[PDB]
């Protein structure tokens, strides 16, 4: 198989001929670890990645040399990104040598506007007026001019959308629906686009019109085909003025038509995802679950190789936005078609030697797979780790940070099992724990944090006792990311059965209530919750009267949200441990605290009452 190494030089030469893309090559070679298993499937997938034409040529020649050696013992798409980055280097470079307003060319001019329009000169002279216009925008604005009106007695054409009804058009949407306005009728495809304005009935109108329209377009899917639809939709779902509802509804029609169309969507897949991937990152939750759903339906609807070969060029894209949302995309498609099918792609990506941004993306993909799949990662956990491990030592920083973070997400979905799979990862991490300043440090603390519950109370005894020091020292950083991490950490480390009470009581609690309990935290949401939880667990170990006894005095504090916080904390605490531990005086302060806080209620909520 060393002739699969020199043979990797051969394949690199041939595929490089048919330049420089590392990914497809490592995808090709990625079938070697199964060796003697590899089969015709490698022709299918690669069929989409390069030209399906050369596909039969390369895969065929590969099986010949492979079987022989054993016995004796889209391109345009990527071509565009290269030119895009090269122009970026040209312009960026020029300023050093030295936006949307950059002058344009007639082919670029023919690129924007749709079919059926003519360019006009009226004169050569009026054109010379347009050329002097720049000079005369300064010159003739500094000259005599004015307007006036005379009193004289006085046809008025216009168009709404008439036929029978045609529910109303917003003043902007005309640009899209103008073709419907003209009343020319009854004389092929132009009549399918014309009748496809039933979209307008879905967008605006009465709810019944939306319903009936929606069905009518569902049953016409197979008829009209995906091309005309998406051609007439994606502009709308791309509209700058788009509503909330209208968005959601167009999402619905995209789903319902994608329950039917299967082989048809292959050309449009990317052309879909570009609009849809912004749904994954959103403030609305229901928008996110919808988005994940429709990308699931799309990826499963299309083919694996369709998705893969589609989505490569977005990995190295300059903007990180598309890289990120693209990572969540791979998460969704991987939930669709399963981890093992998509593994060799990834495992090829994280070893890409071109540039770091790729590896950063792929690692983020590992993470978002960890979040999405969650508990179900379990079988392939080992292979995944074996992928990610090589980034922890990389020279670039990001890759290290996001890497260890992805380990965190894994272990958190790995809740206790598979400890030895993380095994080889540890020894570097602990070492890094020493030497790091800034965010990466905190990230490591996140990872190690989720790890510790998965270790043995003996090994984790030592290792834990080591983590406690840095954990102490790092309470004081102003970083809120920091405080989140170290907070949840304190939960897991100090919520360990193998930790001694008195040590926490002395070393931890005083700084804990000092720095962590403040009015910066409580006003925030996540910090609020997580703080509640951590405090609850510390109570779960050191006991009740301590924690409560220290936080009672704050029931009487001015602000609400803070009072709400300590109130729900007391609630959960006395919920678990029981009130038996509480002494007398502190109980007087309790009841008085609870009445007092209850007597001033700015909002209506259960927390005070259930409390």
């Amino acid at each position: 198989a060393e002739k699969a190494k020199a043979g990797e030089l051969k394949v690199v030469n041939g595929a490089a001929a048919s330049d420089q893309t590392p990914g497809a090559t490592p995808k090709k070679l990625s079938s070697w670890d199964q060796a003697e298993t590899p089969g015709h499937t490698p022709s299918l997938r690669w069929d989409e990645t390069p030209g399906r034409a050369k596909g039969s040529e390369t895969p065929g020649a590969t099986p010949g040399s492979k079987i022989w050696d054993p016995t004796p013992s889209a391109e345009t798409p990527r071509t565009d990104r290269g030119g895009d980055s090269i122009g970026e280097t040209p312009t960026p470079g020029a300023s050093k040598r030295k936006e949307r307003n950059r002058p344009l060319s007639d082919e670029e001019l023919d690129a924007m506007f749709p079919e059926g329009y003519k360019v006009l000169p009226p004169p050569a002279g009026y054109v010379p007026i347009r050329t002097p216009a720049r000079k005369l925008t300064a010159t003739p604005t500094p000259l005599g001019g004015m307007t006036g009106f005379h009193m004289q007695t006085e046809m008025k054409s216009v168009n709404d959308q008439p036929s029978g009804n045609l529910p109303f058009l917003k003043p902007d949407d005309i640009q899209y629906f103008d073709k419907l306005l003209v009343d020319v009728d009854e004389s092929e495809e132009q009549k399918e686009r014309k009748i496809m304005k039933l979209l307008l009935k879905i967008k605006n109108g009465t709810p019944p019109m939306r319903k009936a329209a929606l069905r009518q377009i569902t049953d016409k899917a197979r008829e009209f085909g995906a091309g005309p639809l998406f051609n007439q939709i994606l502009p709308l779902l791309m509209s700058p003025t788009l509503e909330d509802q209208e968005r959601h509804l167009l999402v619905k029609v995209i789903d319902r038509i994608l329950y039917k169309l299967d082989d048809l969507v292959r050309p449009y897949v990317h052309k879909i995802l570009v609009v849809i991937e912004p749904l994954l990152i959103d403030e609305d939750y229901y928008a996110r679950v919808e988005g994940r759903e429709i990308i699931s339906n799309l990826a499963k609807a299309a083919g694996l190789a369709t998705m893969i070969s589609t989505m490569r060029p977005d990995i190295d894209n300059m903007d990180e936005y598309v890289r990120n949302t693209t990572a969540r995309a791979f998460a969704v498609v991987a939930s669709a078609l399963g981890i093992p099918s998509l593994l060799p792609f990834l495992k090829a990506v994280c070893k890409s030697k071109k540039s770091w941004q790729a590896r950063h993306t792929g690692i983020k993909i590992v993470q978002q797979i960890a979040i999405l799949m969650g508990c179900a990662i379990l079988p392939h956990l080992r292979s995944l780790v074996e992928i990610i491990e090589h980034g922890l030592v990389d020279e670039q920083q990001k890759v290290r940070t996001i890497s260890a973070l992805a380990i965190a997400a894994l272990a958190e979905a790995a809740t206790p099992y598979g400890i030895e799979s993380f095994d080889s990862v540890l020894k570097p991490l602990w070492k890094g724990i020493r030497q790091h300043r800034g965010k990466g440090l905190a990230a490591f603390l996140k990872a190690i944090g989720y790890l510790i519950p998965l270790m043995d109370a003996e090994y984790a005894n030592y290792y834990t006792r080591e983590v406690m020091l840095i954990l102490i020292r790092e309470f004081q950083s102003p970083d809120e990311e920091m405080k989140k991490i170290v907070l949840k950490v304190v939960k897991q480390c100090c919520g360990t059965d193998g930790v001694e009470a008195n040590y926490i009581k002395t070393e931890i609690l005083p700084p804990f209530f000092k720095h962590f309990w403040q009015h910066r935290m409580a006003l925030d949401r996540r910090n609020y919750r997580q703080l509640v939880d951590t405090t609850v667990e510390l109570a779960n170990k050191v006991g009740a009267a301590e924690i409560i006894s220290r936080i009672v005095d704050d029931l009487k504090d001015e602000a609400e949200q803070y009072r709400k916080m300590v109130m729900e904390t007391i609630e959960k605490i006395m919920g678990n441990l029981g009130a038996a531990d509480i002494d007398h005086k502190l109980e007087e302060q309790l009841i008085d605290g609870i009445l007092y806080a209850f007597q001033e209620q700015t909002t209506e909520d259960s927390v005070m009452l259930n409390g």
Binding site: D255, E293, S296, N297, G374, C375, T415
Partner: protein, 85 residues
């Protein structure tokens, strides 16, 4: 859009919220609670601890199957925790 996950049935007890509390899952009925619900920790984990099998709120009780689904033996299939698609 809404369908069962049907992962293998474990020993974890089902948890229903306020809303779904009385419903037998499959028959949608309140009649004759008899046997008990089991779903996999793959479906029930973490933020899903004591989560509703349906809406996603905290479970205040445990779902009981009807006698109807009992004799038809449907309670023995994959874990009936509904997943949105």
């Amino acid at each position: 859009d809404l369908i069962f996950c049907r992962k293998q049935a474990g020993v974890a007890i089902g948890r229903l919220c306020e809303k779904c509390d009385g419903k037998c899952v499959i028959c949608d009925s309140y009649v004759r609670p008899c046997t008990l619900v089991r779903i996999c920790d793959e479906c029930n984990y973490g933020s899903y601890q004591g989560r509703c099998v349906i809406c996603g709120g905290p479970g205040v009780s445990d779902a009981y199957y009807c006698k109807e689904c009992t004799i038809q033996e449907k309670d023995r299939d994959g874990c009936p925790k509904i997943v949105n698609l």
